[PDB]
Design a binder for this molecule. Structure first.
Ligand SMILES: [Ca+2]
Ligand SMILES: [Ca+2]
Ligand SMILES: [Ca+2]
Ligand SMILES: [Ca+2]
Ligand SMILES: [Ca+2]
Ligand SMILES: [Ca+2]
Lengths: 68, 60, 144, 56, 68, 142, 144
């Protein structure tokens, strides 16, 4: 007669647990972003480091062959 | 007492967050792509710099 | 009434000048009165777990006979931005007693292990460098 | 004395070489999750309407 | 000086080129080791995001199937 | 203090049957001599930090008169895999002595906050479930 | 005492192929006699310093009853071009006696520590590499 009233309880429990799983995945997304932000910024420190090292090796050799 | 409004607001949040999950996951793909290209770029500097270091200690 | 535990307003910022993370504690709201006079004597105890030395733990001043205190203090941590990700800040709230062992009002946490508002506070702090992010946190049980 | 310089430049090479594969394995992993999110929102939009139509 | 002055510079600078070569091997290994370990922290948090997304999809599929 | 402190063979595996992480301490080699007789009597102690209670710590039997022992023992940490990346496995290799406080040779802490070869072992345990990964570790601590 | 100690013709050349300093001991003239026959038995002892192991010292072949020696010999030093400019090449002539220790007749120190014609001779060897230059230096009293 009214099977939809029982189905309303089943589907209501289906909606409220779906909040948890996506919000848990949203936390996982935030967690995975935190390390990628660091990896991105640390990979910029490498580039500038590698540039700074290259200029110092130039500066090193250029200082020798200034004074003969 | 209530009109049964939990279904409507919970489902709207589910669609809202899943939308944020899709765009958040795509923004990683651009960050990973650029980093992949940066790692390759750093590999050029390393090979180039090792040539300077190998040339410095071998001056004769 | 076990449920009336309270809320706490935390502040965070990584200073590049100073070279560290500054944890600010401004005030609590409606703390659990665990005395024999319908009030508390609360103070906040911070602990940046796990691998930190003698500068891991810090504590505020003790405010007495009030459930809505006024700390307005900040504490410095000599930490690197890269190393700051994996740490966690266990913000605890205690009721002081001179005569016997202290009573536990409530507690909070901030880190990568945390969830929701706790996680989004820790996320925005590391992303937004040299920026003061502040938001409330509802107090939870069982930090001893 | 300066054998450190030899093994440093070898270790720098060896790390960076596999540091490519770290990015490629990240690149392949984010693809499978991106496809997975598209599967979910087709299922979530369908399940939304199927619940909404049942409540009418 | 000036004969001594020119000679003393030639060592100072030549020895510095050898040390800037030695220091430059260390700067790279230090910066590169950090990107090695930073990238593992992203890979740990990726797989946790991936398995949590598996729970979402499993959670979705079930409440679709049983509802029919 | 001293360079040649020793290498410890450690193995890890998450067993979904037993429902937890199983640390298998196999043996050690080239330990620092910290006795008058010129050998050691070592035993390894584990500690999975920090929310674990009575089953946080695990001890090992004491071997005798050797800088190259042979343990062959496996312990069992009952823990859900979902919560595993939060934890840290502090492995401490000691030297037993009778009439005073035990000397410390060196140690190793595996986890997400670890570096170099230690961080890789822990990641390769997380990824490869029900699979045994056995890697050596250097002993470097206070 | 004994002002006329004589003098020595010394050459200096940095080889690129051999990779070091070539020190030639060519001639000596009018050296100080310290025997009962008005002659000496001289030989030129070299000593480069500091931080030279077994390659530091060298000795010429002995000459018999003469105050005008004819050596014509060369001595090689394993040393880098820049590293040589710190060093001091001490050159010393000694009267060889069979019964007793060797009497000191004269010496001469080349390098940055020295002055005058001794300084420029070290300078012009280094600043004009792969080129032999030869100059006469006066023998003196120094660490007999
Ligand atoms: Ca109390
Ligand atoms: Ca009190
Ligand atoms: Ca001992
Ligand atoms: Ca012992
Ligand atoms: Ca004599
Ligand atoms: Ca004689």
């Amino acid at each position: 007669q009214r099977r939809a009233d029982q189905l309303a309880d089943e589907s209501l429990e289906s909606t409220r647990r779906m909040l948890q799983l996506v919000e848990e995945s949203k936390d996982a997304g935030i967690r995975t972003l935190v390390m990628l932000d660091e990896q991105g910024e640390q990979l910029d420190r490498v580039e500038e480091g590698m540039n700074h090292i290259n200029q110092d090796m130039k500066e090193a050799e250029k200082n020798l062959k200034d004074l003969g | 007492f209530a009109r049964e409004n939990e279904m409507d607001e919970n489902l709207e949040q589910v669609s809202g967050i899943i939308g944020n999950l899709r765009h958040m996951a795509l923004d990683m793909g651009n960050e990973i792509d650029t980093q992949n290209r940066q790692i390759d770029r750093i590999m050029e500097k390393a090979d180039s710099n090792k040539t300077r270091i190998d040339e410095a200690n071998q001056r004769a | 009434d076990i449920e009336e535990r309270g809320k706490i307003l935390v502040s965070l910022m990584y200073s590049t000048q100073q070279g560290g993370l500054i944890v600010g504690i401004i005030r609590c709201v409606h703390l659990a009165a665990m005395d024999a006079n319908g009030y508390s004597d609360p103070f906040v105890k911070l602990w940046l777990k796990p691998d930190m030395g003698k500068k891991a733990k810090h504590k505020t001043q003790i405010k007495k006979k009030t459930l809505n205190p006024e700390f307005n203090e900040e504490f410095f941590y000599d930490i690197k931005h890269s190393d700051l990700a994996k740490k966690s800040l266990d913000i605890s709230v205690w009721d002081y007693d001179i005569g016997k062992s202290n009573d536990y009002i409530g507690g909070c946490q901030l880190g990568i292990s945390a969830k929701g508002e706790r996680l989004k506070h820790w996320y925005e702090c590391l992303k937004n460098k040299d920026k003061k992010i502040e938001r409330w946190h509802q107090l939870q049980n069982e930090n001893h």
